[PDB]
Amino acid sequence: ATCDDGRTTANAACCILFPILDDIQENLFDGAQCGEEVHESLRLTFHDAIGFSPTLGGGGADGSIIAFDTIETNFPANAGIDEIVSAQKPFVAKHNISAGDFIQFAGAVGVSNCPGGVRIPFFLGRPDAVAASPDHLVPEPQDSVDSILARMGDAGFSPVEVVWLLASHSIAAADKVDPSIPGTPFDSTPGVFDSQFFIETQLKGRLFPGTADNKGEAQSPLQGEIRLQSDHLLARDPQTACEWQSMVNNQPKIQNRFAATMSKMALLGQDKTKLIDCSDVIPTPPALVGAAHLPAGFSLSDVEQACAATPFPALTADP
Numbered sequence: 001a002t003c004d005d006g007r008t009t010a011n012a013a014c015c016i017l018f019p020i021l022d023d024i025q026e027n028l029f030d031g032a033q034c035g036e037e038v039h040e041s042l043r044l045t046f047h048d049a050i051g052f053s054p055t056l057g058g059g060g061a062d063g064s065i066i067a068f069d070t071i072e073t074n075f076p077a078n079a080g081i082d083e084i085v086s087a088q089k090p091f092v093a094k095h096n097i098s099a100g101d102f103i104q105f106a107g108a109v110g111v112s113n114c115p116g117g118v119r120i121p122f123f124l125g126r127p128d129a130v131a132a133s134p135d136h137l138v139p140e141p142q143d144s145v146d147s148i149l150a151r152m153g154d155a156g157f158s159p160v161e162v163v164w165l166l167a168s169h170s171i172a173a174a175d176k177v178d179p180s181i182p183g184t185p186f187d188s189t190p191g192v193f194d195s196q197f198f199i200e201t202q203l204k205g206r207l208f209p210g211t212a213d214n215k216g217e218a219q220s221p222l223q224g225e226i227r228l229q230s231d232h233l234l235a236r237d238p239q240t241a242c243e244w245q246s247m248v249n250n251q252p253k254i255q256n257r258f259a260a261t262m263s264k265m266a267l268l269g270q271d272k273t274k275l276i277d278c279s280d281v282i283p284t285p286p287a288l289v290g291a292a293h294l295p296a297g298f299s300l301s302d303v304e305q306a307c308a309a310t311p312f313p314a315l316t317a318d319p
């Protein structure tokens with residue numbers, strides 16, 4: 001199909017997304033950057049979608065975190081979410097798509113701005129949310145591996161899928177874990193969708209970048225980085241450690257698995273066969289910049305190897 005402005009897309013219904021794309025690229029993502037609002041919007045996709053439990057209720061990727069913001073943004077696990085919800089809400093009001101669609105669309109557009117990134121499949125047509133998520137459905141950084149895997153499993157994800165989804169922490173920071181150091185990233189390349197997160201979480205912790213007694217925080221290897229206790233544990237636990245290490249210097253796997261598993265997450269509570277595929281509206285991401293490395297001055301001995309079957313790969317350090 002050819003849209004009114006000459007841009008093309010496979011299914012004509014998708015034409016409505018082009019003005020939305022242009023608006024968010026300039027006015028949400030600061031001119032199509034992989035920056036704060038991309039990171040926040042990607043976190044929002046998860047906090048919206050994971051509110052889904054056969055047992056407990058919630059409609060998944062339904063826009064409930066916007067439509068029922070008064071309730072959901074007060075949940076403890078949604079600390080700091082109010083900011084991106086408030087930023088997104090006027091775009092939803094202005095344009096003519098549902099909040100559930102908007103959240104997933106903004107997340108997919110944002111990830112596409114990040115070097116090394118992917119186009120997450122995107123489907124149009126979610127109806128408006130009809131219930132708020134229950135509380136206590138979003139994993140927290142102080143939670144055990146068993147708890148996290150059980151919650152994610154309840155929503156439909158296997159342990160390897162949890163690892164694949166956590167490639168998101170390659171383009172991510174924390175504002176609330178240690179509020180003395182807001183905006184501290186989880187890897188050294190928060191503007192690049194790469195394997196640095198999986199490398200750097202494997203390093204022996206050295207220091208706290210801010211204060212030393214925050215709930216859900218582990219020692220970081222680097223002053224410029226914060227480490228979650230959940231990521232500390234997932235990198236090392238026998239259930240997940242081999243998958244975690246398998247991501248290191250495996251950009252094609254990170255790409256393929258993140259796109260596929262994000263599509264699954266974006267469709268929680270939804271039925272793809274009732275939606276329209278608008279995947280081709282998402283921009284082409286830039287190629288990876290940089291390559292997998294240890295931080296300058298580090299060596300393999302600084303890696304806490306946790307996969308008995310397979311030694312950690314031989315990376316070189318920054319000069």
Ligand code: HEM
Nearest residue numbers: 039042043046139140141165168172173174175176177230
């Ligand atoms: C599996 C368990 C997970 C836990 C315990 C967890 C925990 C956290 C925490 C504590 C933060 C920092 C929030 C703050 O203090 O500002 C964060 C940020 C973030 N999370 Fe995760 N997360 C998990 C999974 C995911 C998944 C599946 C996604 C996929 C979309 C995701 C995407 C992000 C992003 C992109 C940010 C960065 C937000 C920003 O820069 O402000 N997380 N996560």
Ligand SMILES: [Ca+2]
Nearest residue numbers: 048051060064
């Ligand atoms: Ca939801």
Ligand SMILES: [Ca+2]
Nearest residue numbers: 170189192194
């Ligand atoms: Ca990164």
Ligand SMILES: [Fe+3]
Nearest residue numbers: 067068069070
């Ligand atoms: Fe509201």
Ligand SMILES: [Fe+3]
Nearest residue numbers: 096097098128
């Ligand atoms: Fe509407």
Ligand SMILES: [Fe+3]
Nearest residue numbers: 097098099128
């Ligand atoms: Fe509506």
Ligand SMILES: [Fe+3]
Nearest residue numbers: 080083175182
């Ligand atoms: Fe913030």
Ligand SMILES: [Fe+3]
Nearest residue numbers: 188295296318
């Ligand atoms: Fe580096």
Ligand SMILES: [Zn+2]
Nearest residue numbers: 029030036037
């Ligand atoms: Zn900005």
Ligand SMILES: [Zn+2]
Nearest residue numbers: 036037040083
């Ligand atoms: Zn912000």
Ligand SMILES: [Zn+2]
Nearest residue numbers: 036037040083
């Ligand atoms: Zn923001």
Ligand SMILES: [Zn+2]
Nearest residue numbers: 019094095096
């Ligand atoms: Zn519009």
Ligand SMILES: [Zn+2]
Nearest residue numbers: 145237238239
């Ligand atoms: Zn375990």
